[PDB]
Design an enzyme around this catalytic site. Structure first.
Site, PDB file in Angstrom:
ATOM      1  N   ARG A  30       0.831  -1.181   0.000  1.00 25.88           N
ATOM      2  CA  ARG A  30       0.000   0.000   0.000  1.00 25.88           C
ATOM      3  C   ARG A  30       0.857   1.217   0.000  1.00 25.88           C
ATOM      4  O   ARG A  30       0.540   2.197  -0.692  1.00 25.88           O
ATOM      5  CB  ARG A  30      -0.840   0.078   1.231  1.00 25.88           C
ATOM      6  CG  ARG A  30      -1.536   1.421   1.428  1.00 25.88           C
ATOM      7  CD  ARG A  30      -2.456   1.332   2.657  1.00 25.88           C
ATOM      8  NE  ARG A  30      -1.732   0.957   3.889  1.00 25.88           N
ATOM      9  CZ  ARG A  30      -1.099   1.797   4.723  1.00 25.88           C
ATOM     10  NH1 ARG A  30      -1.076   3.131   4.454  1.00 25.88           N
ATOM     11  NH2 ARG A  30      -0.533   1.322   5.871  1.00 25.88           N
ATOM     12  N   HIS A  73       4.336   1.547  -0.830  1.00 29.37           N
ATOM     13  CA  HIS A  73       5.378   1.698  -1.817  1.00 29.37           C
ATOM     14  C   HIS A  73       5.197   1.175  -3.196  1.00 29.37           C
ATOM     15  O   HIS A  73       6.065   1.349  -4.016  1.00 29.37           O
ATOM     16  CB  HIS A  73       6.624   1.068  -1.271  1.00 29.37           C
ATOM     17  CG  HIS A  73       6.984   1.558   0.076  1.00 29.37           C
ATOM     18  ND1 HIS A  73       7.246   2.883   0.328  1.00 29.37           N
ATOM     19  CD2 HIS A  73       7.146   0.909   1.243  1.00 29.37           C
ATOM     20  CE1 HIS A  73       7.567   3.032   1.596  1.00 29.37           C
ATOM     21  NE2 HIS A  73       7.513   1.849   2.176  1.00 29.37           N
ATOM     22  N   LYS A 115       3.133  11.396   6.687  1.00 32.93           N
ATOM     23  CA  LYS A 115       4.366  10.636   6.723  1.00 32.93           C
ATOM     24  C   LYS A 115       5.412  11.507   6.065  1.00 32.93           C
ATOM     25  O   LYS A 115       5.260  11.925   4.921  1.00 32.93           O
ATOM     26  CB  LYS A 115       4.227   9.325   5.988  1.00 32.93           C
ATOM     27  CG  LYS A 115       5.520   8.580   5.801  1.00 32.93           C
ATOM     28  CD  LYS A 115       5.221   7.183   5.245  1.00 32.93           C
ATOM     29  CE  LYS A 115       6.441   6.223   5.250  1.00 32.93           C
ATOM     30  NZ  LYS A 115       6.085   4.928   4.604  1.00 32.93           N
ATOM     31  N   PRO A 116       6.502  11.786   6.771  1.00 34.16           N
ATOM     32  CA  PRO A 116       7.590  12.618   6.275  1.00 34.16           C
ATOM     33  C   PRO A 116       8.123  12.278   4.933  1.00 34.16           C
ATOM     34  O   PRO A 116       8.213  13.141   4.060  1.00 34.16           O
ATOM     35  CB  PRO A 116       8.680  12.444   7.333  1.00 34.16           C
ATOM     36  CG  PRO A 116       7.927  12.178   8.551  1.00 34.16           C
ATOM     37  CD  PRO A 116       6.824  11.250   8.104  1.00 34.16           C
ATOM     38  N   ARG A 132       8.582  13.666  -0.380  1.00 33.09           N
ATOM     39  CA  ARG A 132       9.132  14.278   0.822  1.00 33.09           C
ATOM     40  C   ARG A 132       8.269  15.476   1.183  1.00 33.09           C
ATOM     41  O   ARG A 132       7.927  16.280   0.323  1.00 33.09           O
ATOM     42  CB  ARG A 132      10.557  14.776   0.592  1.00 33.09           C
ATOM     43  CG  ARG A 132      11.446  13.808  -0.206  1.00 33.09           C
ATOM     44  CD  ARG A 132      12.947  14.161  -0.216  1.00 33.09           C
ATOM     45  NE  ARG A 132      13.542  13.903   1.091  1.00 33.09           N
ATOM     46  CZ  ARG A 132      14.106  12.759   1.477  1.00 33.09           C
ATOM     47  NH1 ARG A 132      14.188  11.707   0.658  1.00 33.09           N
ATOM     48  NH2 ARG A 132      14.573  12.674   2.715  1.00 33.09           N
ATOM     49  N   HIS A 164       9.602  -3.030   4.462  1.00 36.08           N
ATOM     50  CA  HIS A 164       9.899  -1.624   4.667  1.00 36.08           C
ATOM     51  C   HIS A 164      10.684  -1.133   3.516  1.00 36.08           C
ATOM     52  O   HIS A 164      11.504  -1.859   2.949  1.00 36.08           O
ATOM     53  CB  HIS A 164      10.757  -1.381   5.875  1.00 36.08           C
ATOM     54  CG  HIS A 164      10.107  -1.734   7.150  1.00 36.08           C
ATOM     55  ND1 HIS A 164       8.962  -1.112   7.592  1.00 36.08           N
ATOM     56  CD2 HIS A 164      10.478  -2.593   8.128  1.00 36.08           C
ATOM     57  CE1 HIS A 164       8.659  -1.562   8.795  1.00 36.08           C
ATOM     58  NE2 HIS A 164       9.564  -2.460   9.143  1.00 36.08           N
ATOM     59  N   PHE A 165      10.454   0.116   3.160  1.00 34.30           N
ATOM     60  CA  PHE A 165      11.257   0.696   2.106  1.00 34.30           C
ATOM     61  C   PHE A 165      12.363   1.403   2.858  1.00 34.30           C
ATOM     62  O   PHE A 165      12.110   2.322   3.620  1.00 34.30           O
ATOM     63  CB  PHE A 165      10.484   1.699   1.280  1.00 34.30           C
ATOM     64  CG  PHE A 165      11.235   2.109   0.073  1.00 34.30           C
ATOM     65  CD1 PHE A 165      12.223   3.066   0.160  1.00 34.30           C
ATOM     66  CD2 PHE A 165      11.048   1.431  -1.133  1.00 34.30           C
ATOM     67  CE1 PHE A 165      13.017   3.343  -0.927  1.00 34.30           C
ATOM     68  CE2 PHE A 165      11.851   1.704  -2.225  1.00 34.30           C
ATOM     69  CZ  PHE A 165      12.838   2.665  -2.117  1.00 34.30           C
ATOM     70  N   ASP A 166      13.596   0.975   2.635  1.00 37.26           N
ATOM     71  CA  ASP A 166      14.725   1.545   3.363  1.00 37.26           C
ATOM     72  C   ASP A 166      15.412   2.734   2.734  1.00 37.26           C
ATOM     73  O   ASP A 166      15.699   3.707   3.424  1.00 37.26           O
ATOM     74  CB  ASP A 166      15.812   0.488   3.618  1.00 37.26           C
ATOM     75  CG  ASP A 166      16.705   0.856   4.815  1.00 37.26           C
ATOM     76  OD1 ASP A 166      16.198   0.896   5.948  1.00 37.26           O
ATOM     77  OD2 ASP A 166      17.899   1.117   4.617  1.00 37.26           O
TER      78      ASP A 166
END
Lengths: 119, 119
Positions: free
Chosen positions: B10, B12, B36-37, B80, B114-116
């Site tokens: 959802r 990424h 979300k930053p 961002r 997680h997207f790192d």
């Protein structure tokens, strides 16, 4: 509860490419639980839209007589479900046009609460 | 509960203008309850991304040891928050780039959770 006025602004206002409808129908919650078949987003200013409520009175498509037709054309985007759209994967076609809009108005002050049609 | 696997999808995945982030971040619900930053969406297929878990092992920004770096560069879009972004009016700067991605994998089977980072 969400006011009819705030609902209209969430469903219809976006004052300001091909996936515009896909992303906005999702962002504005018209794909939660079901795919809104058809939806119009108006790009004129919120003020220009609210003013439609003091313009030409027309009969709504449903017979209610609280519809108002905009005196001038408006940049709007038509979002229509593609043939592949099937909740939970709502997909839309994006079409931009300049047309007069017909909205329904209610409350005091009277503001638009339902997007009725585009002439 | 929403699984880490699905959350990652959802958050990424968007396989397939400069408001793209404003729209998608809103749509994939990362502007809900808070903004979300930073967030990246990957446009490659789900299989390519899930395949990353079998690719190059790398350390994670956060010191964890379950990160993997894609072997291929991928078409991604970076989101961002802009400086004036502030819940509920989350706002983002959209940046499309072609970079190798690094995601954190987990679960059985090992999929992206997680997207790192992108490199």
């Amino acid at each position: 509860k969400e006011s009819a006025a705030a609902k209209f602004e969430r469903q219809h206002m976006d004052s300001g490419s091909s996936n515009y409808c896909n992303q906005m129908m999702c962002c504005r919650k018209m794909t939660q639980g079901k795919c809104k078949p058809v939806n119009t987003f108006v790009h004129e200013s919120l003020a220009d839209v609210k003013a439609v409520c003091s313009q030409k009175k027309v009969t709504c498509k449903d017979g209610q007589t609280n519809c108002y037709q905009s005196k001038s054309t408006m940049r709007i985007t038509d979002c229509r479900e593609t043939g592949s759209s099937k909740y939970p994967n709502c997909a839309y076609k994006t079409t931009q046009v300049e047309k007069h809009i017909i909205v329904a108005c209610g409350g005091k002050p009277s503001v638009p609460v339902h997007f009725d049609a585009s002439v």
